[PDB]
């Protein structure tokens, strides 16, 4: 049960100070992120089983997809309006399944169809709060040296290896992944 550097996780070369304890990086364009988030519920298993009071964060990355940057801004609006759970399925579906989200306008329509008030979306998208959530995400991707998604970094020091989990099923995988995050947190 004892984890090893290079096996289940790796050390960031340049550790990040003042970082949230668990930072998730994802893309609405990524098949593996879709599976993690929506099919096999890996990140939700991690979130539900960390210690009480663990400081967590979930950021979108710019580097996949035609609308990478724009979707990072939309994710900031989701965080700002508190509608993450509300809109995430529709966004994954629209980007990857029906492939019907192809402009900034489609992104907006997806929020609206998912029950987000148009007036709130339109105000949020140009707010200081959202401006800063955008730079926060972009800067984190750089500072944490994120090259691929999904990716989870613990205490600004340790990066999960998605190919390094010991598991024979999705159910075992979710639990083991969580077990590793928790062991990393106890370092």
CA distance 125 to 4: 42
What domains lie within the chain, and their CATH numbers?
Answer: 1-187 (3.40.30.10)
Contact 65, 46 (CB under 8 A): no
CA distances from 98 to 8, 38, 92, 93, 109 (A): 34, 15, 9, 6, 14
- 57 phi, psi to nearest 5 deg: -155, 150
What are the residues facing 25 on neighbouring strands?
Answer: 59, 151
Resolved by = X-ray
């Amino acid at each position: 049960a004892d984890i090893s550097e290079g096996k289940q996780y790796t050390n960031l070369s340049k550790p990040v100070a003042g970082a949230p304890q668990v930072v998730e990086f994802f893309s609405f364009y990524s098949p593996h992120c879709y599976q993690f988030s929506e099919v096999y519920k890996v990140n939700s298993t991690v979130e539900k089983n960390v210690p009480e009071n663990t400081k967590m964060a979930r950021y979108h990355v710019d580097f996949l997809g035609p609308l990478g940057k724009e979707m990072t801004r939309a994710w900031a609006v989701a965080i700002a309006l508190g509608v993450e759970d509300q809109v995430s399925p529709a966004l994954f579906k629209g980007i990857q399944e029906t492939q019907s989200i192809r402009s900034v306008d489609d992104i907006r329509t997806t929020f609206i169809n998912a029950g987000v008030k148009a007036e709130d979306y339109d105000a949020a998208i140009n707010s200081f709060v959202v401006n800063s959530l955008v730079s926060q995400q972009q800067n984190a991707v750089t500072d944490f040296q994120i090259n691929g998604v999904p990716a989870m970094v613990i205490d600004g020091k340790y990066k999960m290896k998605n190919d390094g989990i010991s598991a024979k099923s999705p159910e075992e995988y979710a639990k083991a992944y969580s077990d590793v995050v928790n062991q990393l947190l106890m370092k």
